[PDB]
Amino acid sequence: MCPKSEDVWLEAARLQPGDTAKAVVAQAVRHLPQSVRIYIRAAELETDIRAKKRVLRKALEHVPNSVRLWKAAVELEEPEDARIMLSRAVECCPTSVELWLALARLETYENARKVLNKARENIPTDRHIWITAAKLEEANGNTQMVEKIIDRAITSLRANGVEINREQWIQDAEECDRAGSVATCQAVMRAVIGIGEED
Amino acid sequence: RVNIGEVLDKRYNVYGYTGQGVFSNVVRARDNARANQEVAVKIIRNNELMQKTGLKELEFLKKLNDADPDDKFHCLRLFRHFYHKQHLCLVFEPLSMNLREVLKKYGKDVGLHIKAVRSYSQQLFLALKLLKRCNILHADIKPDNILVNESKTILKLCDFGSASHVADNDITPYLVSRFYRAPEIIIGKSYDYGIDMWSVGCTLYELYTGKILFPGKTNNHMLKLAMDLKGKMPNKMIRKGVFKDQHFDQNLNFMYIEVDREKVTVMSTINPTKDLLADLILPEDQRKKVHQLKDLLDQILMLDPAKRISINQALQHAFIQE
Amino acid sequence: AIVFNATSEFCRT
Amino acid sequence: PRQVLDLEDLVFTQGSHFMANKRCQLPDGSFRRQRKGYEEVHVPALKPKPFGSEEQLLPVEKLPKYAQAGFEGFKTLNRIQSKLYRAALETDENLLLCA
Q: Find which of A50, A57, A83 to mutate to test the C interface (most C CBs within 10 Å of its CB).
A: A57
Closest residue to C1, CB basis, from D30, D34, D39: D30
- Could you give the CA distance from residue B41 to residue D90 in angstroms, rounded to a whole number? 97
Please answer whether residues A188 and A150 qualify as being in contact, where contact means their C-beta atoms are separated by less than 8 angstroms.
yes
8 Å CB contact of A125 and B1? yes
CB proximity list for B36: less than 8 A, separation 6 or greater: B30
- Could you give the CA distance from residue D33 to residue D11 in angstroms, rounded to a whole number? 36
Closest residue to A81, CB basis, from C6, C11, C13: C6
Q: Beta-carbon neighbour count of residue B287 at 10 Å? A: 12
- 3-state helix/strand/coil string of chain B: CCCCCCEECCCEEEEEEEEECCCCEEEEEEEHHHCCEEEEEEECCCCHHHHHHHHHHHHHHHHHHHHCCCCCCCECCEEEEEECCCCEEEEECCCCCEHHHHHHHCCCCCCCCHHHHHHHHHHHHHHHHHHHHCCEECCCCCCCCEEECCCCCCEEECCCCCCEECCCCCCCCCCCCCCCCCHHHHCCCCCCCHHHHHHHHHHHHHHHHCCCCCCCCCHHHHHHHHHHHHCCCCHHHHHCCCCCCCCECCCCCEEEEEECCEEEEEECCCCCCCCCCCCCCCCHHHHHHHHHHHHHHHHHCCCCCCCCCCHHHHHCCHHHHC
Q: Identify the DSSP state of A94.
A: T
Resolution for the entry shown, Å: 5.8
Beta partners for residue B258, in sequence order: B263
Cβ-based burial of D28 (10 A; exposed 0-12, middle 13-18, buried ≥19): exposed
How many residues does this entry show for chain C? 13
- Could you give the CA distance from residue B289 to residue B178 in angstroms, rounded to a whole number? 27
The three-class DSSP label of residue D40 is strand
Please answer whether residues B133 and B311 qualify as being in contact, where contact means their C-beta atoms are separated by less than 8 angstroms.
no
Sheet strand arrangement including B78-83: B7-8, B12-20, B25-31, B37-43, B88-92, B78-83
Phi, psi of B189 (to 5 degrees): -85, -175
Q: Decide if B249 is catalytic.
A: no
Beta partners for residue B98, in sequence order: B147
Q: Beta-carbon neighbour count of residue D75 at 10 Å? A: 9
Q: How many CB pairs under 8 A join A and B?
A: 23
| Residues on chain C touching D27 (C-beta within 8 angstroms) | 1
Choice among B31, B70, B140, B170 that is catalytic: B140
- Could you give the CA distance from residue A111 to residue A118 in angstroms, rounded to a whole number? 10
CB proximity list for A174: less than 8 A, separation 6 or greater: A185
CB proximity list for B132: less than 8 A, separation 6 or greater: B193, B311
DSSP one-letter string for D43-89: ---PPPPPP-TT-----TTSS-HHHHTTSTT-SS--HHHHHTHHHHS
**CA geometry: angle B282, B287, B288, nearest 5 deg:** 150
**CA geometry: angle A17, A20, A26, nearest 5 deg:** 130
- Could you give the CA distance from residue A188 to residue A174 in angstroms, rounded to a whole number? 10
CB proximity list for A42: less than 8 A, separation 6 or greater: A13, A21, A22, A25, A26, A29, A55
Q: Beta-carbon neighbour count of residue A57 at 10 Å? A: 18
- Convert D29-57 to b/e letters by CB count within 10 Å (16 or more is b): eeeeeeeeeeeeeeeeeeeeeeeeeeeee
Helix (H) or strand (E) holding D23: none
- Convert B104-122 to b/e letters by CB count within 10 Å (16 or more is b): eebeeeebbebebbbbbbb
- Could you give the CA distance from residue A168 to residue B266 in angstroms, rounded to a whole number? 39
Please answer whether residues A104 and A118 qualify as being in contact, where contact means their C-beta atoms are separated by less than 8 angstroms.
no
- Could you give the CA distance from residue B143 to residue B99 in angstroms, rounded to a whole number? 5
First to last CA, chain A: 65
- Convert B296-311 to b/e letters by CB count within 10 Å (16 or more is b): bbbebbbbbbeebbbb
The three-class DSSP label of residue A176 is helix
- Could you give the CA distance from residue B262 to residue D39 in angstroms, rounded to a whole number? 66
Whether A88 has its CB under 8 Å from any CB of chain C: the answer is: yes
8 Å CB contact of B19 and A198? no
Please answer whether residues A35 and A42 qualify as being in contact, where contact means their C-beta atoms are separated by less than 8 angstroms.
no
Helix (H) or strand (E) holding D39: strand D39-41
Name the structure determination technique. Answer: cryo-EM
- Could you give the CA distance from residue D70 to residue D54 in angstroms, rounded to a whole number? 26
The three-class DSSP label of residue D36 is coil
Phi, psi of D62 (to 5 degrees): -80, -20
- Could you give the CA distance from residue D81 to residue D88 in angstroms, rounded to a whole number? 9
How far does the CA of residue A136 sit from the closest CA of chain C (Å)? 25
Please report how the helices A18-31 and A6-15 are oriented relative to each other, as an axis angle in degrees rounded to 10.
Answer: 160
Beta partners for residue B38, in sequence order: B30
